[PDB]
Structure 1
């Protein structure tokens, strides 16, 4: 359910199946590591990753069915997303690429930003979230194999 990854051997940015949990009725939940930054070489600011969370919640769903949710990782170098379905790194990679283009081009208010809809509405940074999305697309994504410790 959670592969033991060697963080010194991956090459960001990438999409990686991080684990798979089988449900009691026989379905599968695939977990993905959506890595923007190389582990231990810098982190996304908290405001920017919060904004990425709000933007990717809707844009990943526009390009991929079965999304449970997209969340920030505590290490702030990427996002975690669980999907209901069999593993499909290629398809998730294409959906992530399309959602990042949407994110980089998002030039309207951030969705769900108010004291009513967000637990820290003052901590957002649209420009930095858009630049991180452009940065990933500029470097280029790939499907990263899990290298175990």
Structure 2
């Protein structure tokens, strides 16, 4: 239940999807979300661009959603992973994500936290590509994706 056994060939990106839920000792819930930009195995986001997306979404997601633990790039680079403290709310998360993406598409100022002091690879960034990826998601249109499990 902490990480649904998703069949990646059956989803339709871009989308927002509850990926699992971990219950804490006191009974709180940590909801995990799959914020999918690209269709699995049909292409990937460039490393610099996803690095920039990581920087931008850390703040923009928090501007539109409470309880955010952190927003991380997925190793497969087709989307971002985000854990949130709270019961599952795919609809609410989708709306926050949509708003954060508009903020991202319109981000014409410098990328935050890009320096020797605040970033581990400050030379690896791409605002233009980051902005266009946000635009592409909004153009295509988000939806809440149901998890289709692997029969195994």
TM-score by length of 2: 0.98
Report the Cα offset of residue 41 of structure 1: 0.1
Report the Cα offset of residue 21 of structure 1: 0.3
Structure 1 unaligned spans of 5+: none
Structure 2 unaligned spans of 5+: none
Distance 2:148 2:112 in 1: 36
Distance 1:78 1:4 in 2: 17
Number of residue pairs aligned between Structure 1 and Structure 2: 149
Report the Cα offset of residue 82 of structure 1: 0.1
Distance 2:27 2:133 in 1: 37
User: 1:123 is paired with a residue of what secondary structure?
Assistant: coil
Report the Cα offset of residue 35 of structure 1: 0.0
Report the Cα offset of residue 16 of structure 1: 0.1
Distance 2:27 2:44 in 1: 37
Report the Cα offset of residue 66 of structure 1: 0.1
User: What residue in structure 2 maps to residue 27 of structure 1?
Assistant: 28
Report the Cα offset of residue 124 of structure 1: 0.1
User: 2:98 is paired with a residue of what secondary structure?
Assistant: helix
Report the Cα offset of residue 30 of structure 1: 0.1
User: 1:21 is paired with a residue of what secondary structure?
Assistant: strand
Distance 2:148 2:122 in 1: 38
TM-score by length of 1: 1.00
Distance 1:58 1:73 in 2: 18
User: What is the CA deviation profile of residues 63-100 of structure 1, one whole-angstrom value per residue up to 9, with x for unaligned ones?
Assistant: 00000000000000000000000000000000000000
Report the Cα offset of residue 14 of structure 1: 0.1
Matched, 1:66 2:67: yes
Structure 1 runs of 4+ aligned residues shifted over 6 Å read none
